[PDB]
From Swiss-Prot:
The active site is at 35, 52. Keywords: Allergen, Antimicrobial, Bacteriolytic enzyme, Disulfide bond, Glycosidase, Hydrolase, Secreted, Signal. Its EC number is 3.2.1.17. Residues 1-129 form the C-type lysozyme domain. It comes from Gallus gallus. This is Lysozyme C. The lineage of its organism: Eukaryota, Metazoa, Chordata, Craniata, Vertebrata.
Length: 129
């Protein structure tokens, strides 16, 4: 599913992602735009054999299990395919544990390079919240 700008913002807020661990709602919406272009069915392969899945591109080396990553962990205890659904519940819950491992939202390379230090509130401008 291809989400709308204001549509995805409302969905993230309903799941308690807004200001989770100190990161405002505009930060998560900016990260989803450049990681996925608001597309829940996005997948991308990595160098070491791992793969990123979903609207936030969660990595299979530690967090989910796709059955093709030798010597990896499944710390979120979930199949990677669950992060591609039209419902964003599984991506949000695992993202909360990822952001709690000690490095914050710096685990997402796209956020650090394209959202960190910008006008992130403009991504929710005009929306009815
Ligand atoms: Br847009
Ligand atoms: Br914001
Ligand atoms: Br595996
Ligand atoms: Br394969
Ligand atoms: Br494990
Ligand atoms: Br949803
Ligand atoms: Br932090
Ligand atoms: Na894994």
């Amino acid at each position: 599913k291809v989400f709308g700008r204001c549509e995805l913002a409302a969905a993230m807020k309903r799941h308690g992602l807004d200001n989770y661990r100190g990161y405002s709602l505009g930060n998560w919406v900016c990260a989803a735009k450049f990681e996925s272009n608001f597309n829940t069915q996005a997948t991308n392969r990595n160098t070491d054999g791992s793969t990123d899945y979903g609207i936030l591109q969660i990595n299979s080396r530690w967090w989910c299990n796709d059955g093709r990553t030798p010597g990896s962990r499944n710390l979120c205890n979930i199949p990677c395919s669950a992060l591609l659904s039209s419902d964003i519940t599984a991506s949000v819950n695992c993202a909360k544990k990822i952001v709690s491992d000690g490095n914050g939202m710096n685990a997402w390379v796209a956020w650090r390079n394209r959202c960190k230090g910008t006008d992130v509130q403009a991504w929710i401008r005009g929306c009815r919240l």
